[PDB]
Design a protein around this ligand. Structure first.
Ligand code: HEM
Ligand code: HEM
Ligand code: HEM
Ligand code: HEM
Ligand code: A1ADX
Ligand code: A1ADX
Ligand code: A1ADX
Ligand code: A1ADX
Ligand code: ZIQ
Ligand code: ZIQ
Ligand code: ZIQ
Ligand code: ZIQ
Lengths: 343, 344, 347, 347
């Protein structure tokens, strides 16, 4: 077993054909364009491999055994480390000027990055919903794909996404049981009391400060009490402005507030990594847009791509938005030894 | 064609075969090990493509037309940007623990990085000398290679290296003509006078401070005057402690000292990027070492051999680094009045 | 001269006071928040130092001596290396969770990043226009500043910006002289001829959907390229702030783009590249800042929304340099510069 | 307060005095040299703040409550994120050429990085032992310091280091109890049996060079693995400074390595990983510092050579955590921990 055979370099290093040269007009920088995309695709393959392995752990029930949490978080962390490298990798393609790109751009049609099967599979397997995607040229993204590739993309839409698998796990988070620690019941009561206490403090001296604090209080009150409005949540779900079930949201908040408790330490890291992956995917899209602009100019692909840099494409937006519902520590329902050892 | 066909993804994305799985014992992390190496090899191919294009510009005479210096420096800069990414790329393989690596390491034998043809081609084309390589297991590096691969490696050794092509260009640097700006003659004269003047000043509170300055002066004097010792240079060349001809060294120093002159601005950037490539190659080797250590331990010695590769022995453009040693006060630098400037 | 004295560490390392601790409730992560900002501010000071030195080289005429172009480009390159580090530096503040931030956030009011004098000085000196700034809570940016700080900001608004100094230099670019190489006149003629030739080819084809598509594309390309020679349209887009460089400076920039390999234009071209780099890195700084405000405060608190608005071409000072990609033409249409004239671009 | 007051910018941004300018010969790049060091020192202060807080958690017994492990690992992780930035930060000082550095270097004497209090405090608090430091010009590092600074450094040497505090915690790792899971007893037995089995396998092979090699390899691997159970060899390697951890702490570390997926060991394993990360990044810092001294001053006691000697395992405090890779065995040799005996490692 030789290095080159083990790595199948007879394939990897014989996959570089310049279209400019095939048409009798070799342009040096086309080689860079090819390699860059090939490297992205290798790493997309690796991300898919990690992500599919994690989906499997959830889907088959292995995640129920908490011994598997280290591997889950290590692999999700690994995805974010790869995505960071992929963001940095744009720095290489930025050494190609727009003038040099323009010398071989004509030979590219009818190819586009849009046709990256793996990029789509990745979006779908994380949990981008087809109905929420921004249309390209007034049409669905999958119409750009055909045959088995179209079929694979459909499977990736219909099979359970990372979002759905995490959701189901969040729904089982310990502590939500009304008969048990009764997290939600206690949280509602403590926030009500907390707000009442604050109001009383505010009620007494009249000044600019008071005027502001009253307004702030009213806004904070509206936000925090809205958390207990399950109907509003259902409505925002139907519009796609939220993604997690109400119960899963409760699970996530339980993990956030009790993160230090031993059984929640690695789960909290997992939630953190999920947000990280969303943020890095967005950064990838942002860096991609800025580079399309520098190469093709304004006037559109550019405008479509800019539209993808939105909360529409943030699958774990609900994990980000839990910051909105932070409260002072002393309002958090206490978890003393009496009710401590369940975690 | 369409994206997948244009990029020949039917090849690139069907090149992942886990030996652990071929032997009925699939280990998840083996996939990462394969992809990481495949990505390194794609970028090595790109570096070779840039470097060969630059060697060709020198070798075919195009570099003589100074309009081509922007392309030369852009491509060398591009090599450095790729190397930076390759250094950062170790962060991905560091997400594999030694315990997990140990689950599939057995299936790797007898394969090794030592068998990376492209890495060797890159070393050779930059200018690593075979006689200066540290031996591993009392073995020649090319012993690990056979067939047309061994042939390619031989060509890479025998064809002109980047070092040699840069050397030849440096030897033609304007300003060295004895009948012209006479850089070397004037520099020797100015440094001699400069040192004499300083000595006189030092000759003055008759204290240990004076003594210390005396000692420093004597050391600085020895260093600076050694620059004009062409025989010493030839001797250090024969040992491989320097690499550039004496004349090329003079060219480089001309570019260093007159870097702001318009004809030397982009040449100076080129010299800077050559040093950058040497620094980044060494950084790659160092990051590689630290990772071998974390995975195999000090015992498994590859670790120690690799530590040895982090040495000036593997720095092709060491002469460009060492020109820092011969910095002098600005006012000692032979003046280039616009009248003379005209040539630059 | 000792290290600590030379670096005035008695100042730098005695500037960390946690408000949480001043109010009898020390919160560990506040220290990180202070240091992070202090490090940003040190690097902003360094960016201002480089940028002021480069402004001065332009303003005082030193840039006319082309010996100084290496220093100009090295310092602008240095600014972009610093900005890259500043973008990476957000990775440190991302190790603070929103829950931990929430424990000391109350002690921060009424302080805000908006009160960073240096950040505003940097924006102004590069060339962000006051009239183009997006209002925050229907307020002017300078109203958050008073006394000498307000005065400094005003000077930074009134003094020549990097954009204006680069503009003036671009207007002097060799090759534009109608009596000389006559770049503009020749470019207009070559593009007109080039378009005419292309039209004839397409016209020769037989009516088809494909031919229509070619005709449509041709018509778009034609409109774009010929719009470049419409000086009045340029003046109009200037007045709206959709462009920033004078028409003549735009000509200079395109001259440098197309003739970048000519010796006198090699370092100028790198300068143009570094100016675009600085714009892109500034935007990336703003973007990374936004994403982190979101993670800490949530969708509304909107700060998030105002900051998202700052990530726009409205804040890109060198937008015109980016948009020269729009006007790329086949290489063979570029007016030739044989040695006959090339000598004017030798040095 | 206001931003500038809160961050004490009246201190931070009035700490830049160029010695070149004080002596009537301002050199532009000296400003960069000052700011770069000031930024390093801010981040050293932050690293000390995190490291001291973690030492305190160990020293005061708080680490005994496993609820605190998340905070411990987040802060050590944060130290490694800062160190990574500090490694990248050399890229800024690399935009200063040796020629430009040479224009102001004369004004620096007698200041040096050697005089960084915080850098020494950091080395000492992690656990660099004074007896293992390479001497520079045959002098102790502390001799470069006086007054309160010398006193601070003494405290840093005499107080419990991170190494010592982690050692004590590792010694208490669950599973080592002879009367309990008896990890060490079982590991010795399983490795002995494992080696016997392997010997039989190889001996069964047909006479071949491959067999001969496997024999030799086996003999080497056998010596290595069995040497682990030689506590006297360990004491000897301790004396020479080739190991740093007590024998029992090493057992704890290996317990965590092999049983990392067990819930109680998941975050402990991450801690071990972060300790190695910090050591690797400290070494990378020293390496990048060396390469830059070389680029500025040339090959030439020679600072270069002293510094090069610092880039070695003698300055890696947690070298033992790296070297546990030497003692990896097939998974199936690891003493089994069924739920029957799994209970003690469940939260
Ligand atoms: C010269 C550099 C590049 C240019 C000019 C460019 C241009 C474009 C354009 C115009 C689109 C919109 C679809 C279209 O109209 O064709 C697009 C989409 C895309 N590009 Fe790029 N691209 C570049 C580099 C890359 C690289 C390096 C990748 C790496 C895989 C990539 C991946 C994609 C993907 C996945 C899409 C679909 C994005 C989505 O729908 O959200 N591109 N690109
Ligand atoms: C698990 C990670 C790695 C380990 C344990 C490892 C181990 C080793 C060892 C022990 C050697 C010395 C030769 C030998 O004894 O076989 C070596 C050499 C080498 N490795 Fe790696 N390696 C790793 C990752 C990589 C990666 C990612 C690359 C990237 C292509 C690479 C490329 C090389 C090259 C080119 C050499 C020979 C270079 C020279 O002779 O200086 N290795 N490796
Ligand atoms: C916990 C981290 C951070 C949070 C939550 C945060 C929050 C905010 C918010 C809400 C604003 C909008 C103005 C306001 O409502 O007060 C703002 C603006 C600003 N922040 Fe931050 N910030 C953070 C970190 C930083 C850092 C590290 C810097 C670096 C110096 C910084 C510099 C600024 C600047 C300069 C502005 C004004 C920029 C503009 O108007 O476009 N902030 N920040
Ligand atoms: C122009 C750049 C630099 C040069 C030429 C340089 C030079 C040196 C030299 C020669 C030494 C050995 C002690 C001596 O003989 O004086 C040293 C040590 C040191 N430098 Fe630097 N240095 C540079 C940048 C930095 C930076 C940016 C830092 C950041 C704080 C730094 C921190 C240190 C430290 C802590 C030591 C002591 C290291 C040890 O003993 O292990 N230096 N430097
Ligand atoms: C592989 C192949 C091409 C690309 C592109 C890309 C970028 C700019 C382009 N301008 N024209 N084309 C071809 C057209 C084909 C039909 N769809 C619209 C674009 C381009 C392609 C980006 N990544 C690639 C990877
Ligand atoms: C491809 C395939 C393997 C490697 C290695 C690598 C890393 C650790 C190893 N431990 N044993 N072996 C096999 C031996 C055979 C050659 N002589 C010593 C090593 C390993 C191989 C690194 N890069 C690779 C790429
Ligand atoms: C220094 C000081 C504070 C900051 C902030 C920042 C971030 C989040 C905040 N939430 N409340 N406040 C105080 C408000 C006072 C009145 N309205 C403006 C903000 C915050 C301040 C970011 N960077 C800082 C640097
Ligand atoms: C602050 C101040 C100076 C430094 C240096 C540094 C770098 C290069 C030098 N060459 N000479 N000197 C002065 C000598 C005085 C003490 N003995 C050796 C050095 C230098 C100082 C690095 N970091 C600094 C921070
Ligand atoms: C037994 C369990 N692992 C419980 C569980 C569910 N979600 C969680 C989140 C954090 C901590 C634990 C859980 C399971 O049902 O999967
Ligand atoms: C005509 C020439 N380009 C002269 C030359 C040689 N080396 C240089 C270094 C810097 C500047 C110019 C040169 C050539 O012979 O290549
Ligand atoms: C003499 C001159 N340096 C000419 C000049 C102006 N802009 C340029 C751009 C590229 C090259 C040269 C110039 C000056 O007027 O500054
Ligand atoms: C009660 C305990 N936290 C036990 C302990 C010690 N070291 C460990 C390593 C991993 C897991 C647990 C421990 C303590 O004694 O600190």
């Amino acid at each position: 077993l030789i290095y080159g055979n083990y790595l199948h370099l007879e394939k990897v290093l014989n996959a570089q054909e310049l279209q400019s040269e095939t048409k009798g007009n070799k342009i040096h920088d086309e080689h860079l364009f090819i390699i860059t995309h090939q490297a992205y695709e290798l790493w997309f393959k690796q991300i898919l491999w990690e992500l599919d392995s994690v989906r499997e752990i959830f889907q088959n029930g292995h995640v129920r055994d908490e011994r598997n949490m280290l591997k889950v978080v290590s692999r999700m962390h690994r995805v974010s480390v790869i995505l960071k490298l992929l963001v940095q990798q744009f720095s290489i393609l930025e050494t190609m000027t727009a003038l040099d790109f323009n010398d071989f751009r004509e030979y590219l049609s009818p190819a586009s990055g849009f046709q990256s099967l793996q990029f789509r599979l990745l979006e779908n397997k994380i949990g981008v919903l087809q109905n929420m995607r921004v249309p390209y040229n007034r049409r669905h993204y999958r119409d750009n794909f055909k045959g088995e590739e179209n079929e694979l993309l459909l499977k990736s839409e219909q099979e359970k996404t990372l979002l759905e698998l995490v959701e189901a796990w969040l729904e089982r988070t310990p502590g939500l049981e009304p008969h048990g620690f009764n997290f939600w019941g206690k949280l509602e009561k403590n926030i009500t009391r907390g707000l009442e206490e604050e109001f009383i403090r505010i009620q007494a001296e009249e000044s600019e400060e008071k005027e502001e604090q009253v307004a702030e209080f009213q806004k904070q009150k509206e936000v925090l009490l809205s958390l207990f409005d399950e109907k509003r949540h259902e409505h925002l779900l139907s519009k796609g402005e939220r993604r997690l079930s109400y119960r899963a949201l409760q699970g996530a908040l339980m993990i956030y507030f009790y993160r230090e408790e031993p059984r929640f330490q690695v789960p909290f890291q997992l939630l953190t990594s999920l947000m990280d992956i969303d943020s890095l995917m967005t950064k990838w899209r942002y860096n991609h847009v800025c580079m399309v602009h520098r190469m093709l100019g304004s006037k559109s692909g550019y405008h479509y791509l800019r539209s993808t840099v939105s909360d529409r494409y943030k699958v774990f937006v609900d994990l980000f938005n839990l910051s909105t519902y932070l409260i002072p520590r002393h309002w958090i329902p206490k978890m003393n030894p009496t009710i401590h050892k369940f975690l």
